[PDB]
Amino acid sequence: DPNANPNVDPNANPNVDPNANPNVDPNANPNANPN
Amino acid sequence: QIVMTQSPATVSVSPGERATLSCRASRSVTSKLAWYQQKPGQAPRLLIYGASTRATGIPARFSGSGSGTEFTLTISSLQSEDFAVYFCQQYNNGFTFGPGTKVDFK
Amino acid sequence: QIVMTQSPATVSVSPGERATLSCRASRSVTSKLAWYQQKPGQAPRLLIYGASTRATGIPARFSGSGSGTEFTLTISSLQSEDFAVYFCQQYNNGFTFGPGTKVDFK
Amino acid sequence: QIVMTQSPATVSVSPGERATLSCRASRSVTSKLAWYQQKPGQAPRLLIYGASTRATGIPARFSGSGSGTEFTLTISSLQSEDFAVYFCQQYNNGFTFGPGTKVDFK
Amino acid sequence: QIVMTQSPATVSVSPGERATLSCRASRSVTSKLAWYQQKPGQAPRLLIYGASTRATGIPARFSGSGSGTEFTLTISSLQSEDFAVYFCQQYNNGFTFGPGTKVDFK
Amino acid sequence: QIVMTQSPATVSVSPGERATLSCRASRSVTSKLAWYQQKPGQAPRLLIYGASTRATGIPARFSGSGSGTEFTLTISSLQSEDFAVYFCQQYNNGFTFGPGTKVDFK
Amino acid sequence: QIVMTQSPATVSVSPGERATLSCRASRSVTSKLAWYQQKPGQAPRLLIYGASTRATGIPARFSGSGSGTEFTLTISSLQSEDFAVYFCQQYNNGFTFGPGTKVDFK
Amino acid sequence: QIVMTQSPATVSVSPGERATLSCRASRSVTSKLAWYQQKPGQAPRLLIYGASTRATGIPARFSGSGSGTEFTLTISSLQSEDFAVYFCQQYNNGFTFGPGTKVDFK
Amino acid sequence: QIVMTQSPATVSVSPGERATLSCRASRSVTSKLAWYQQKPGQAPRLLIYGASTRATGIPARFSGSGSGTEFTLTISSLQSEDFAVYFCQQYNNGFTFGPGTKVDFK
Amino acid sequence: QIVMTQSPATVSVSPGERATLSCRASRSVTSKLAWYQQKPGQAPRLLIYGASTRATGIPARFSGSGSGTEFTLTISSLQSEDFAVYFCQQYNNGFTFGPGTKVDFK
Amino acid sequence: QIVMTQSPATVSVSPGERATLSCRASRSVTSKLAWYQQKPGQAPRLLIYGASTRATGIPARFSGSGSGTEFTLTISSLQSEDFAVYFCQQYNNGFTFGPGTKVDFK
Amino acid sequence: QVQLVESGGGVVQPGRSLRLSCAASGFTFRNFGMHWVRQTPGKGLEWVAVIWHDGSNKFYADSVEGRFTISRDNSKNMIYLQMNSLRVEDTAIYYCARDSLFYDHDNSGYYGYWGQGTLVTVSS
Amino acid sequence: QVQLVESGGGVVQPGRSLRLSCAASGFTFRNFGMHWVRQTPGKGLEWVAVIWHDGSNKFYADSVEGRFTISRDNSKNMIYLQMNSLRVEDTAIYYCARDSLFYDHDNSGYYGYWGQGTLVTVSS
Amino acid sequence: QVQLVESGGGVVQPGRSLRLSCAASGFTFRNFGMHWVRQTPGKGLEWVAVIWHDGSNKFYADSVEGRFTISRDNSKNMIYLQMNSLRVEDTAIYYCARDSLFYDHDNSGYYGYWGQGTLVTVSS
Amino acid sequence: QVQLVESGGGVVQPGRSLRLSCAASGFTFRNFGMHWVRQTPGKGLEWVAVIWHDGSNKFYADSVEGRFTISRDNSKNMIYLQMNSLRVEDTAIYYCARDSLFYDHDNSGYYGYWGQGTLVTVSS
Amino acid sequence: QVQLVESGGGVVQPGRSLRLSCAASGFTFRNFGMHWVRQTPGKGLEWVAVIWHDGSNKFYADSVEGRFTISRDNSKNMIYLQMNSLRVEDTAIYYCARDSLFYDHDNSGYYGYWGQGTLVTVSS
Amino acid sequence: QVQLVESGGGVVQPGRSLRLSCAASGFTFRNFGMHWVRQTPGKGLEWVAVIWHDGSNKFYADSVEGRFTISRDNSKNMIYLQMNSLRVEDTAIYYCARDSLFYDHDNSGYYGYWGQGTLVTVSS
Incomplete structure (x- = not known):
């Protein structure tokens, strides 16, 4: 929809979401970074 | 954004009486x-936050109700320390306050 | 999308007079x-933005009104610096602009 | 945040019957x-975790189902060991527990 | 975590014909x-790795496609050495394998 | 890793005009x-390194721009010693080069 | 380097009562x-040294814990000879001491 | 590396007034x-070093603050000896200096 | 320094069976x-010395392994003279021993 | 101490060809x-002594190199007199030799 | 052992100016x-002996400096009687000389 | 003082590519979405493209669909419009204008602050 | 005991810069977003700015867009409001306020706690 | 065998400080996030705190916000809960709980493994 | 030529321990992370463990969490897997698999190169 | 004046080993990481290997992984590349390239300074 | 009383070499690293080179890479800067600066104590 609002909504939640997963991700890249 | 108006500007209530405060959004x-x-x-x-929920430490004497564009706040049994000015805020769209309604001794 | 037109193409209004412009959408x-x-x-x-609300810094001389498919822009008392061409835009479905109506001295 | 309520408070079922515990969210x-x-x-x-998935080591006797605001826990045929108090937790927004529903002898 | 299913369990095709294997994620x-x-x-x-990218040394005979929860592996013209059991793995969340699909002579 | 493509393969411009070379990443x-x-x-x-920063000693004629997956190399007013092959490299993930673009006399 | 602060400055405790001391790092x-x-x-x-390791000859009465910017010294059953001023030192970045907290008779 | 700029180029303040010097990093x-x-x-x-910490012997008149890409140096009640040119340096990545800001009599 | 632990304190293996000993460092x-x-x-x-190197005269029966904080000693097929108490030493920081694990008849 | 290894054991090089020997350290x-x-x-x-320096009287044909754990010896154009067995020694820690690599006719 | 190299081999200068002579060791x-x-x-x-000490009777015109692997010889106002060839020696490991550099009229 | 300055103008031949840059200052750039406006004599104002606050969603007009590319760099506060394969119908004044004076969820798409504009001419 | 204290107030001339600070204690500062609220007598309460928990996003009121800068540092538990190009409309008492009493994902934007307020007057 | 053992319980006076420790064994400690759960008779179970795998983020309940501090040390495999300014409402049994039975990106926040619990009572 | 050769298999009794080893050659060992994959007839392939390039992080499956320990030695190009407290459910073929064919930041977690496999049986 | 010159080039048979050396002067050699970049006609420019400033980390391309070996000696200001098990696909000009014009923490991996290049031919 | 005095200034022709020396007193010389800072009228302050406490590491600016050489003698409390291949752009005042006021592991790279400086002019 071209008429959707492009500006950011300031009413978004500014607090940290405690329901984010506290477990460490096993899917992180295990290879050394050449960059 | 949203225009907030409060009516009446001032209310005169004796201690122990009930007080009605109105908030209206555009x-x-x-x-x-x-x-x-x-x-x-x-x-x-x-x-009061949300539409009716009460903040911690606030006595149940304060009670708010309403939704949409008509909101009301009622003090069931006004005490001596409840004489003050009350402001109305909406945070659904932006952050705007109301002009304020004063509670005065009758 | 929405074809936008303005009428009349040009207006000849002396300073201090009331100037009216018409905008019509398909x-x-x-x-x-x-x-x-x-x-x-x-x-x-x-x-003017939306239907009637005025941008900050725009004097009350500029007045907009109308809804649906008929919109008007009225100048209560046209001054010297307001002699120009006015554009009418819709942003409900897409972004289209009108042909433009020029205000000229009479 | 989210208040969790259960009904009924206590359920009386003899071993071998079926007991259903309900959980409701605001x-x-x-x-x-x-x-x-x-x-x-x-x-x-x-x-049970999620809405229906069973923790490892839990017999297929326990069956969870439901979503949204109406949840239920079904014990198809209770043994003697299945008599206890059951708590309903939601972790979608915050971490709140239910008051607890007790299953006792009939 | 995510369970991986493959269907059909066994595919019968004669050499020279196109054989398609399917993989589904919960x-x-x-x-x-x-x-x-x-x-x-x-x-x-x-x-194949990713969704379609082909490993080095693998002939262009093997062709994979799909995204989301529906994945397919296509053998354009199956040769004599292409008779085996094929496993489907997802590494987006954890590391889970499918049961495996066996391709056999007709 | 990331495959880089450059279009067009060759661009023909006489000295004095404006030449633009495009680079696109997968x-x-x-x-x-x-x-x-x-x-x-x-x-x-x-x-040019980064996306637009110019190496020391490079005349201000060479202007770089773009970010993400669409990059351009712009030459303001080409001299005679600027006829060569231009390569596009990405060093965000691995180190890959483009096929190269030829600029030749028209 | 590191600014070391102790709180409270003085704690009032009686013999046999457990006394605690706090140390904070910038x-x-x-x-x-x-x-x-x-x-x-x-x-x-x-x-105590490290974060909790006890020096030789120090009674097990003294218990320390904490890491990062929150360190505490706990006396399980404070005797008569345990009345003194306790200092907090860090040796990670430089060598800085705390102001010191004094325990006194109640 | 990081390009450092200062604004304004010059400030004119009478003794006893507050002079604010700003700094910006690329x-x-x-x-x-x-x-x-x-x-x-x-x-x-x-x-001032780091972002706000004051070198030994520097009067409390000088107050530095800021973080990220916006830094300011505030002189609360500027005396006669505080008329000079002030330089802004970053040492997070490399060692670059700002162009310098001169404080002059009003 | 480092406190060295071994587990279990006693192992019982018949001759010809494989006995494994564990050593853990703080x-x-x-x-x-x-x-x-x-x-x-x-x-x-x-x-064993190092982590796996075998002293001269020690038969290939004894096989040490492990690194960091987890160390294991494996006796592939224990004979009669291999019944004794095995001590674990670290010489990375100081010279500390383990309590000792005894191998006994079953 | 340090175990020296060489690979391959034998290299077949005709006169006039370049021969390379390898030596690897643990x-x-x-x-x-x-x-x-x-x-x-x-x-x-x-x-050769050191890593690349040539002994006095050794023709410039013999060119060695390498450091750390990978060492090589290169004979630029092997003559008839260069058919022999070549040993690799390290004198950084102890004095240990390699097994030896033999060069024979092709 | 240590090989000394001098650069440049010859320097051209007129009397009265400053001459710099460089010595570098492997x-x-x-x-x-x-x-x-x-x-x-x-x-x-x-x-000059040591790294900068001057022999008894040598004028202060001759100035030496450097340590490690870079050494320089500087003459403040080069005169006529002192046009000659200059040699660089190291006596830390063995006894080697530089090839020698010459100062000449311009 | 919302100041928008347009650059990258000039005269180019048909079938070539030009790049326009729009520098924005006086407001929080990363919190708003910017547009591109075309003004052709004898036709009036014409919309070109719109970009989101982070460039996630981009929408172009039909007359420039598939040929023009919009982009933005929130670390430099600049708005770009890459016009590839320009034609003789593209000669006009191009305006860089911000969407709306302030945030209103139900009112967006009107232009509060405009730039002075740059001229791009396509001719032989 | 969520305590918010303000500082940095005083008297400044129009066109200069003032910096306000806000020290917060009694709660995990880095987990919550903070606001600045302006009280102008004769107008009421006016919102100024909001900053995210980690400072990733910053939003400002329309009246202060491009002139005010809000910032935070989680290692010192303090909130900053950089006020540049002050105008005679900017005289008021500025309140440091925390967002929400606790975390409710669908309810945020109300000020659970307020500070005593610092008074800022601009004049000649 | 995921075995969780609480310790450091006892009886203290209001306004004093108490510390609970939790020794975890039987799993890779630094790969998972842990919780503290409080069981008050007559009220049920209520959540207290959560800590990330590496101790980056810490979230507390409203009732214990600013008074309780959670921490961990992945080297000795322990979880700590520092309780400053205890009050009568903080009398209950405290459980050391692990989040999730196994890693799942879309499913976290449930306690797959509980400790036996320790009793903490405050009075005069 | 990436060659992976396992060893250390054999027969074990339930409740005992076995240590598998993996010799790697033909590539820069220290630049890549290695996996362990188990194949049980009637169940198929299932992942066991993974280790980082420098051995910083180690992740295990649910069924082997707390019993299996993965290790690596970059100076000898060897991958180990300590299997304590074995059960009859652990009887299968264990493969040493290298992660990824080449370094791609967004694509990792597939097994580019497998070893020939080793047999570990748990029975009395 | 930064000059990079390569040597060790020539013609070798498939399956044999060649050693390229690169001499560097005009800069502090031990403060920068060096690259080897390959140019095969008909294919374009191609990267081969990279070595850290002190040689701690070495990364090779997929096509050369396991066969090539890069090293350096900071005491001789030289860069080497051992090309073992050469194949006909390795016939190209090999450049000695230095990373970056200067030190920038967030911008590295581009080849500021190149050598003249050496030719390696694999054929019979 | 840390006093830093420099010498070796004067007028030299382009393409010639100049050596600056800096004497340090009032502090333990071998426990700190020293910088050279360049000031040119019309350009401002510029960094040149840095050396470690024991002279192990040396880092030079891009504009002086390969031409200037910094060295130190901890036995004579002197800092040296050899400036070969001088060019007209090098006319400036060179300051001897000490890094940091005191040892702070997370804060270093600022010049607490400066010297008076010497003037080096390159011209014919």
Whole structure:
């Protein structure tokens, strides 16, 4: 929809979401970074 | 954004009486509206948040109700310390306050 | 999308008189319509946004009204600096602009 | 945040029957809800996680189902060991527990 | 975590014809899915990685496609050495394999 | 890793006009993309690094721009010694080069 | 380097009652923090080192814990000879001491 | 590396007034930024280091603050000896200086 | 320094079976860990040094392994003279021993 | 101490061709590695000392190199007299030799 | 051992200006390096010993500096009687000389 | 003082590519979405493209669909419009204008602040 | 005991810069977003700015867009409001306020706690 | 065998400080996030705190916000809960709980493994 | 030529321990992370463990969490897997698999190169 | 004046080993990481290997992984590349390239300075 | 009383070499690293080179890479800067600066104590 609002909504939640997963991700890249 | 108006400007109620405060928004704010109590020389205090939920430490004497564009705040049994000015905030769209309604001794 | 037209193409109004402009859209645009001020060599300036609300710094002389498919822009007392061509835009469905109506001295 | 309520408070079923425990949320919690079993003197044990998935080691007797604001826990044929207090937790928004529903002898 | 299913269990095709293998995930794995080929007594060999990218040394005969929860592996013209059991893995969330689909003579 | 493509393969411009070379990546490389110029029989020379920053000694004629997956190398008013092959490199993920673009006399 | 603060300055405790002391660091100190006990007219004595390790000859009465920017010294059953001023030192970045907290009769 | 700019180029303040000097970095320097004061014919003097910490002997008149890419140096009640040119340095990535800001009599 | 732990305290294996001993360090030891075999009335005998290297004269039956904080000693097929107490030493930081694990008949 | 290994055991090179020998160390020997040449019935002859420096009287044909754990010896254009067995020694830690690589006719 | 190299081989200058002579060694020499001046027909004369100390009778015009692997010889106002060839010696490891550099009329 | 300055103008031949840059200052750039406006004599104002606050969603007009590319760099506060394969119908004044004076969820798409504009001419 | 204290107030001339600070204690500062609230007598309460928990996003009121800068540092538990180009409309008492009493994902934007307020007057 | 053992319980006076420790064994400690759960008779179970795998983020309940501090040390495999300014409402049994039975990106926040619990009572 | 050769298999009794080893050659060992994959007839392939390039992080499956320990030695190009407290459910073929064919930041977690496999049986 | 010159080039048979050396002067050699970059006609420019400033980390391309070996000696200011098990696909000009014009922490991996290049031919 | 005095200034022709020396007193010289800072009228302050406490590491600016050489003698409390291949752009005042006021591991790279400086002019 071209008429959707492009500006950011300031009413978004500014607090940290405690329901984010506290477990460490096993899917992180295990290879050394050449960059 | 949303224009907030409060009516009447001032209310005269004796201690022990009930007081009715009205808040009206230009557009719909659903169920996101907070009420604030400010005493002279003091910072505003949060009494009711959401549309009816009460902040911690606030006595059940304070009761708010309403949704959409018509909101009301009622003090069931006004005490001596409840004489102050009350502000109305909507936080669904932006952050705007109301002009404020003063509670005065009758 | 929505074909936009303005009528009349030009107006001849002496300073201090009331100038009226008409804007018509092929399809309904509800309450999403803006007016712009185009002076020779100058970028358009937002006068009225949505249906009637006025941009900050725009004097109360500029008054907009209308809804649906009929919108009007009325100048209560046309001054010297307001002699220009006005553009009518809808932003309800897509972004289209009108042909433009120029205000000329009588 | 989200207040969790259960009904009925106590259920009386003889061994071999079927017992159903209900959990209701004030607002939707989608499919994030856990059921815990606590026996006197013991720490709570996770029976079902998500909305239906069973914790490893839990017999197929326990069956969880439901989503949104209406949840239920079904014990198809209770043994003697299935008599305890069951807690309903939602972790979609915050971490709140239910008051607890007790299953006793009939 | 995510359970991986393959269908049909066994595909019968004669050499020279096109054979298609399917893989399904309980939850979306986007485009992180690898295909492996295992012959009896041999370790699995990586055919496709990602969603369609082909490993080095693998002939252009093997062609994979799909995203989300529906994945397919297509053998354009199956040769004599292409008779084996093919496994489906997703590495978007954890590391789970499918049961495996066996391709046999007709 | 990321495969880089350059279009067109050759561009014909006479000295004095404006020449633009485009570089496109399969996956986003943010703002890590360097340009190189190689004359026949000579080693490549670093013209622009980052996305727009110019190497020391490079005349302000060479102007770089773009980010993400669409990059351009712009030559303001080409001289005679600027006829060479131009390579596009990304160093965000791995180190890959483009096929190279030829600029030749018209 | 590191600014070391202790709170409260003085704690009132009776013999047999458990007394606690707090130490705070401006930045991270990890697990390198020592506690010293100074009696009036005497040199400080090393009670705890590292974050919790106890010096030889120190009664198990003294218990330290914490890491990063929050360190505490706990006396399980404070006797008559345990009345003195306790200092907090970090040796991760430089060598800085705390102001010292004095325990006194109640 | 990081390009440092200062604004305004010159400030005119009478003695006893408050003079504010601003500094901006092209990229984030976290909290690693120092301020130097140079009098004509003299070597620069370190006033504030890191982001706000004050070098020994620097009067409490000088107040540095800021983080990220926006830094300011505030002189609360500028005396006669505080007329000089002030330099802004970052040492988070490399070692670059700002162009310098001169404080002059009003 | 480092507190060295062994588990279990006693292992019971019949001749011809494989006996495995474990050694754990409080902190990192890397690859500096030796194993000693002491028979009743005899001095300890160096079996393994480093992490896996075998002392001269020790049969290939004894096989040490592990690195960091987890170390294991494996006796592939224990004969009759291999019944003794095995001590674990680290020499990375100081010189500390383990309590000792005894191998006994079953 | 340090175990020296060479690969391949034998290399077949016709006269006029370039022959390369390899020597690999278990642990780093920096740049202390000497090469020797032994003809049947004769004592070894020092060709290279250090990592690349050539012994006096050794033709510039023999060119060695390498540091750390990977060392190589290159004969630029092998003559008839360059058919022998070449030994690799390290003198960084102890004095250990390699097994030896033989060069024979092709 | 250590090989000394001088650059440039010859320098062209007129009397009254400053002449710089450079000496570089392959390996570190700490601060044991001597400079000698040899005119055509007689033996070299010791100018500087150590790294900067001047021999008794040498004018302060001759200035030496440097340590490690970089060394320089500087003459403040080069005169006529001192046009000769200068040699660089190291006496930390063995006894080697530089190739020698010459000062000549311009 | 919302100041928008347009650059990258000039005269180019048909079938070539030009790049326009729009520098924005006086407001929080990363919190708003910007547009591109075309003004052709004898036709009036014409919309070109719109970009989101982070550039996630981009929408172009039909007359420039598939040929023009819009982009933005929030670390430099600049708005770009890459016009590839320009034609004789593309000669006009191009305006860089911000969407709306302030945030209103139900009112967006009107132009509060305009730039002075740059001229791009396509001819032989 | 959520305590918010303000500082940095005083008297400044129009066109200069003032910096306000806000020290917060009694709660995990880095987990919550903070606001600045303006009280102008004769107008009421006016919102100024809001900053995210980690400072990733910053939003400002329309009246202060492009002139005010809000910032935070989680290692010192303090909130900053940089006020540049002050105008005679900017005289008021500025309140440091925390967002929400606790975390409710669907309810945020109300000020659970307020500070005593610092008074800022601009004049000649 | 995921075995969780609480310790450091006892009886204290209001306004004092108490510390609970939790020794975890039987799993990779630094790969998972842990919780503290409080069981008050007559009220049920209520959540207290959560800590990330590496100790980056810490979230507390409203009732214990600013008074309780959670921490961990991945080297000794322990979880700590520092309780400053205890009050009568903080009398209950405290459980050391692990989040999730196994890693799942879309499913976290449930306690798959509980400790036996420790009793903390405050009075005079 | 990436060659992976396992060893250390054999017969074990339930409740005992076995240590598998993996020799790697033909590539820069220290630049890549290695996996362990188990194949049980009637169940198929299932992942066991993974280790980082420098051995910083180690992740295990649910069924092997707390019993299996993965290790690596970059100086000898060897991958280990300590299997304590074995059960009859652990009887299968264990493969040493290298992660990824080449370094791609967004594409990792597939097994580019497998070893020939080793047999570990748990029975009395 | 930064000059990079390569040597060790020539013609070798498939399956044999060649050693390229690169001499560097005009800069502090031990402060920068060096690259080897390959140019095969008909294919374009191609990267081969990279070595850290002190040689701690070495990364090779997929096509050369396991066969090539890069090293350096900071005491001789030289860069080497051992090309073992050469194949016909390795016939190209090999350049000695230095990373970056200067030190920038967030901008590295581009080849500021190149050598003249050496030719390696693999054929019979 | 830390006093830093420099010498070796004067006038030299382009393409010639100059050596600056800096004497340090009032502090333990070998425990700190020293910088050279360049000031040119019309350009401002510029960094040149840095050396470690024991002279192990040396880092030079891009504009002086390969031409200037910094060295130190901890036995004579002197800092040296050899400036070969001088060019007209090098006319400036060179300051001897000490890094940091005191040892702070997370804060270093600022010049607390400066010297008076010497003037080096390159011209014919």
